Write an enzyme that holds these catalytic residues in place. Structure first.
Site, mmCIF file in Angstrom:
data_model
loop_
_atom_site.group_PDB
_atom_site.id
_atom_site.type_symbol
_atom_site.label_atom_id
_atom_site.label_comp_id
_atom_site.label_asym_id
_atom_site.label_seq_id
_atom_site.Cartn_x
_atom_site.Cartn_y
_atom_site.Cartn_z
ATOM 1 N N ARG A 18 138.699 96.065 14.977
ATOM 2 C CA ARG A 18 138.510 97.510 14.971
ATOM 3 C C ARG A 18 137.192 97.967 14.365
ATOM 4 O O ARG A 18 136.928 99.173 14.403
ATOM 5 C CB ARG A 18 139.661 98.198 14.254
ATOM 6 N N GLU A 50 142.395 83.025 20.248
ATOM 7 C CA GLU A 50 143.319 83.514 21.264
ATOM 8 C C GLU A 50 143.460 82.499 22.385
ATOM 9 O O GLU A 50 144.566 82.261 22.886
ATOM 10 C CB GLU A 50 142.842 84.856 21.819
HETATM 11 C C1 HEM Z 1 135.986 94.342 20.997
HETATM 12 C C2 HEM Z 1 136.493 93.163 20.617
HETATM 13 C C3 HEM Z 1 137.991 93.002 20.266
HETATM 14 C C4 HEM Z 1 138.470 91.942 19.613
HETATM 15 C C5 HEM Z 1 137.661 90.739 19.081
HETATM 16 C C6 HEM Z 1 139.889 92.117 19.451
HETATM 17 C C7 HEM Z 1 140.730 91.240 18.808
HETATM 18 C C8 HEM Z 1 142.094 91.334 18.901
HETATM 19 C C9 HEM Z 1 143.038 90.266 18.675
HETATM 20 C C10 HEM Z 1 142.679 88.823 18.281
HETATM 21 C C11 HEM Z 1 144.260 90.759 18.856
HETATM 22 C C12 HEM Z 1 145.566 89.958 18.774
HETATM 23 C C13 HEM Z 1 145.791 89.612 20.257
HETATM 24 C C14 HEM Z 1 147.058 88.826 20.472
HETATM 25 O O1 HEM Z 1 147.390 87.965 19.610
HETATM 26 O O2 HEM Z 1 147.724 89.058 21.517
HETATM 27 C C15 HEM Z 1 144.144 92.153 19.239
HETATM 28 C C16 HEM Z 1 145.185 93.016 19.515
HETATM 29 C C17 HEM Z 1 145.078 94.344 19.871
HETATM 30 N N1 HEM Z 1 143.893 95.009 20.168
HETATM 31 FE FE1 HEM Z 1 142.000 94.347 19.721
HETATM 32 N N2 HEM Z 1 140.259 93.320 20.037
HETATM 33 C C18 HEM Z 1 139.112 93.895 20.562
HETATM 34 C C19 HEM Z 1 139.067 95.091 21.244
HETATM 35 C C20 HEM Z 1 140.058 96.039 21.393
HETATM 36 C C21 HEM Z 1 139.951 97.291 22.128
HETATM 37 C C22 HEM Z 1 138.676 97.742 22.894
HETATM 38 C C23 HEM Z 1 141.138 97.925 22.037
HETATM 39 C C24 HEM Z 1 141.562 99.293 22.631
HETATM 40 C C25 HEM Z 1 140.727 100.236 23.107
HETATM 41 C C26 HEM Z 1 142.018 97.087 21.227
HETATM 42 C C27 HEM Z 1 143.330 97.320 20.854
HETATM 43 C C28 HEM Z 1 144.225 96.324 20.481
HETATM 44 C C29 HEM Z 1 145.666 96.459 20.364
HETATM 45 C C30 HEM Z 1 146.490 97.733 20.628
HETATM 46 C C31 HEM Z 1 146.178 95.285 20.005
HETATM 47 C C32 HEM Z 1 147.687 95.003 19.785
HETATM 48 C C33 HEM Z 1 148.220 94.401 21.087
HETATM 49 C C34 HEM Z 1 149.668 93.948 21.090
HETATM 50 O O3 HEM Z 1 150.504 94.441 20.291
HETATM 51 O O4 HEM Z 1 149.998 93.077 21.941
HETATM 52 N N3 HEM Z 1 141.323 95.956 20.886
HETATM 53 N N4 HEM Z 1 142.800 92.469 19.247
HETATM 54 C C1 KL1 Z 2 141.166 94.261 23.992
HETATM 55 C C2 KL1 Z 2 141.535 92.850 23.568
HETATM 56 C C3 KL1 Z 2 140.607 92.033 22.933
HETATM 57 C C4 KL1 Z 2 140.981 90.741 22.575
HETATM 58 N N1 KL1 Z 2 140.137 89.881 21.970
HETATM 59 N N2 KL1 Z 2 142.215 90.302 22.843
HETATM 60 C C5 KL1 Z 2 143.135 91.066 23.443
HETATM 61 C C6 KL1 Z 2 144.496 90.478 23.734
HETATM 62 C C7 KL1 Z 2 144.334 90.000 25.181
HETATM 63 C C8 KL1 Z 2 145.523 89.235 25.711
HETATM 64 C C9 KL1 Z 2 146.723 89.230 25.014
HETATM 65 C C10 KL1 Z 2 147.815 88.516 25.500
HETATM 66 C C11 KL1 Z 2 149.105 88.546 24.704
HETATM 67 C C12 KL1 Z 2 150.342 88.386 25.582
HETATM 68 C C13 KL1 Z 2 151.614 88.657 24.773
HETATM 69 N N3 KL1 Z 2 151.749 87.702 23.654
HETATM 70 C C14 KL1 Z 2 152.899 88.066 22.808
HETATM 71 C C15 KL1 Z 2 151.936 86.332 24.159
HETATM 72 C C16 KL1 Z 2 147.704 87.811 26.698
HETATM 73 C C17 KL1 Z 2 146.493 87.820 27.391
HETATM 74 F F1 KL1 Z 2 146.333 87.154 28.552
HETATM 75 C C18 KL1 Z 2 145.418 88.529 26.898
HETATM 76 F F2 KL1 Z 2 144.272 88.510 27.595
HETATM 77 C C19 KL1 Z 2 142.816 92.361 23.820
#
Ligand code: HEM
Ligand code: KL1
Ligand code: HEM
Ligand code: KL1
Ligand code: H4B
Ligand code: H4B
Ligand code: ZN
Lengths: 413, 408
Positions: free
Chosen positions: B110, B284
């Site tokens: 974030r 990831e």
């Molecule tokens: C720009 C680089 C970004 C990085 C490095 C990043 C990194 C991550 C990572 C590592 C997670 C955990 C993903 C998982 O384990 O499934 C995550 C979750 C999340 N990201 Fe970020 N993210 C990025 C951008 C964004 C953007 C652009 C948005 C929205 C506009 C966003 C919103 C979220 C949300 C809502 C989650 C929770 C998803 C869930 O509950 O499955 N992220 N992010």
């Molecule tokens: C914006 C953004 C940036 C960033 N770095 N990563 C993410 C998560 C992306 C992502 C998440 C999952 C989780 C599936 C559900 N999980 C419980 C197994 C599966 C994917 F194929 C995938 F692409 C989002």
């Protein structure tokens, strides 16, 4: 609160149903608007406060021995009630002391080792009166628990709190720890975590040898008196020098660790009684040493020196040089303990056992409180089964609780 | 209350006042913490939510109590009356999207929250239109490897019978096929969704890395299939800087992570199709995607080529192989000039982000269970950071899978 709560395991799809949460007692710290699940730490009782706490525990004890409602149950209830009336406290039977201690372990939501909860040796030290007696009891504990490397879990319970001015306390946070020493130049010799406690010990009389791995003395407080110093006999302190199965240079780092993990700063609450000195010990999971003790930046902090000896590129974080060395350090600790036939469990075996335990608890007990933040090991988290397991955290009693540091509260005679 | 969070490595103590403004539930109570549980309108509910959102928007541009503010609250009240809903101004749409990201407790990335390209797609009416908008998103955000964060916002829900939904959970994923011998080819997490693509007309190449088609639903109608033009899909062959046998594993991944199954809520409105994308954190791919037992599950194979003793767990053979797999992912994206961040850099950035949010905003809701990386936890600074989790709006929420609710 809803009667049934479900938890899912996202890797196996296994759904479990929790009803034990209905018996929850004190507070998590959370509210419906804020969750404090990553917060580490989120005067005596009255006659009226003690009555219902004792009955709850006594009821539960007689439920477990399948004697609920019996004549012995009602007679114990009346004896306890009469005793609280005449002395504002009560004394547990030996059977109830052992049951309570095993269940405080069984209920310890932050403990991954609970598959072993019913195999706990309980040492009743409630007859202790002096710090020398405390020394004797703890020495016998350490020797029993160590068992020449065939470690056995055990607890020694000193006398319960009375008016709050006569507490028994072990001032050590753990029975065996290494000293740390602040140098004038800002650096630290030994274990940086223990600089404050080491300074207390020195002022209290201890002569520091000022090495990297000096076993601290016991600082024991009996009956509210000023604490007193005792040196644990060194032949009772089993230690393991750390070497690596492939890297012959690993022994040249001069690393070693002690075999017995024994927490001594916690409070054991049973039936509303407060056991402020209740040292308990088990055996180590390897990551507690190889990851936290050795590689925390505020501790021995060896990652850099291992990385150099491993000839890693340490200029970019994305070479993962830290992660590579961390694995090798943890291979060495498990290898060094197993070679010396000192009980240890790696993070893979302990978390699989905990899942099996958790599942059996859900089956036979209606649940198993667990603190995910603490159960998941500090390395390789998601390749262990606990990472993918949903957990419910709540507080059951009997329980182990934190308590203030005794130097912060003690009134010096 | 003013709540304090301590970092146990540095002893830095921060003070949270921002939690006073939450109101959505966490799922916990004073007696049971659900911190590790993954998934814990009418005209009358809608106006107070619209009001609070307008109030915080006009307070964020430091014109709280302005005439523009007053006219906006009245404009919104009338529209909820006549039309039972209301339309966000463009400025409110962009502000709401950036703050739903700013407020995502589970997101470690974030620090970038205010650098988000917002694509207003609320004029979209058809699945063809969605496809066009999504292609432009993918091309924009991919940007020849220099990835840029972006979100595309399709029309908000009206009656629940006319939802816009991207049926893919992420815009780019690999298919998964159940084999007759019982094992699985491709990505096992997508077996069912691959079967829904096949049953609807998709002809699968039945490989290990087949980019899935897009399945798009417009205005509550049945979904339609589309293939993303392959020159829009940036992919990275995975190889290792030291182990020259690693490329022989045949591994590759896509460069753009783009979540398309979530719901964006802003001022009581619900945008059920809001694909958003950023760039990957290395773990990831290297830890979860490749080494989860229910995913590509390659630990055994890599440890084989590394000649490791796989007889007992205490050899930590899984841990060694896991680190080498994650070196390869980072090395490969870096060699191909494709934006990626490692968990050391990303978590350091997040601690700095928290520090920023505490000073200028009075807190930062954060889900420790999700922020701490899935490997080498305690050597990242977030392991030692106490975090408070609470729900602020605008926000991204989960929603039901469309194949469980859509009426054909
Ligand atoms: C720009 C680089 C970004 C990085 C490095 C990043 C990194 C991550 C990572 C590592 C997670 C955990 C993903 C998982 O384990 O499934 C995550 C979750 C999340 N990201 Fe970020 N993210 C990025 C951008 C964004 C953007 C652009 C948005 C929205 C506009 C966003 C919103 C979220 C949300 C809502 C989650 C929770 C998803 C869930 O509950 O499955 N992220 N992010
Ligand atoms: C914006 C953004 C940036 C960033 N770095 N990563 C993410 C998560 C992306 C992502 C998440 C999952 C989780 C599936 C559900 N999980 C419980 C197994 C599966 C994917 F194929 C995938 F692409 C989002
Ligand atoms: C027998 C083998 C045991 C294993 C493998 C084990 C494992 C662990 C581990 C890894 C931790 C985390 C410690 C940390 O990170 O600081 C822990 C915590 C804990 N264990 Fe166990 N343990 C064992 C025995 C016991 C026993 C015998 C008791 C009590 C009778 C106990 C009660 C606790 C408690 C209360 C904590 C929480 C400590 C705190 O909050 O700081 N454990 N255990
Ligand atoms: C019974 C038992 C079995 C087992 N395996 N482990 C334990 C914990 C042992 C332990 C814990 C801590 C943590 C200090 C506080 N922490 C917040 C830094 C420091 C130690 F020196 C130590 F030995 C207990
Ligand atoms: C802030 C966070 O709660 C703190 O670093 C915790 C995280 N999980 C832990 N888990 C264990 N087993 N031991 C610990 O000391 C910690 N520290
Ligand atoms: C049970 C637990 O909530 C679940 O495994 C969570 C843990 N933390 C996570 N953290 C991230 N970033 N991603 C995840 O999928 C998960 N899974
Ligand atoms: Zn909670």
């Amino acid at each position: 609160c809803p009667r049934f709560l479900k938890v899912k395991n996202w890797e196996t799809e296994v759904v479990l149903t929790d009803t034990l949460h209905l018996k929850s007692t004190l507070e998590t710290g959370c509210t419906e608007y804020i969750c404090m699940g990553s917060i580490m730490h989120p005067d005596v009782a009255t006659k009226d406060q003690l009555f219902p706490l004792a009955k709850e525990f006594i009821d539960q004890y007689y439920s477990s021995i399948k004697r609920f409602g019996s004549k012995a149950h009602m007679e114990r209830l009346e004896e306890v009630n009469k005793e609280i009336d005449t002395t504002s406290t009560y004394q547990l039977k030996d059977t109830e002391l052992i049951y309570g201690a095993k269940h405080a372990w069984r209920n310890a939501s932050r403990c991954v080792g609970r598959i072993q909860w019913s195999k706990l040796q309980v040492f009743d030290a409630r007859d202790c009166t002096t710090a020398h007696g405390m020394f004797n009891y703890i020495c016998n504990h350490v020797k029993y628990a160590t068992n020449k490397g065939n470690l056995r879990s055990a607890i020694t319970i000193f006398p319960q709190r009375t008016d709050g001015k006569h507490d028994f306390r072990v001032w050590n946070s753990q029975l065996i720890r290494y000293a740390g020493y602040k140098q004038p130049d800002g650096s630290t010799l030994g274990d940086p975590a223990n600089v404050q406690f080491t300074e207390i010990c020195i002022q209290q009389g201890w002569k520091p040898p000022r090495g990297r791995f000096d076993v601290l003395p016991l600082l024991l407080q009996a009956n509210g008196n000023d604490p007193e110093l005792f040196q644990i006999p060194p032949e009772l302190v089993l230690e393991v020098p750390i070497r690596h199965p492939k890297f012959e240079w690993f022994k040249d780092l001069g690393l070693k660790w002690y075999g017995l993990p024994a927490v001594s700063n916690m409070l054991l609450e049973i039936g509303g009684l407060e056991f402020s000195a209740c040292p308990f010990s088990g055996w180590y999971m390897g990551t507690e040493i190889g990851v936290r003790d050795y590689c925390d930046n505020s501790r021995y902090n060896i990652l850099e020196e291992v990385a150099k000896k491993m000839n890693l590129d340490m200029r970019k974080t994305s070479s993962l040089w830290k992660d590579q060395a961390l694995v090798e350090i943890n291979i060495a600790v498990l290898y060094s303990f197993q070679s010396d036939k000192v009980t240890i469990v790696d993070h893979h075996s302990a978390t699989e056992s905990f899942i099996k335990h958790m599942e059996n608890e859900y089956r036979c007990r209606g649940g198993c409180p667990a603190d995910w933040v603490w159960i998941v090991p500090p390395m390789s988290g998601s390749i262990t089964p606990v990472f993918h397991q949903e957990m419910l955290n709540y507080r059951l009693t009997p329980s182990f609780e934190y308590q203030p540091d005794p130097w912060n509260t003690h009134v010096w005679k």
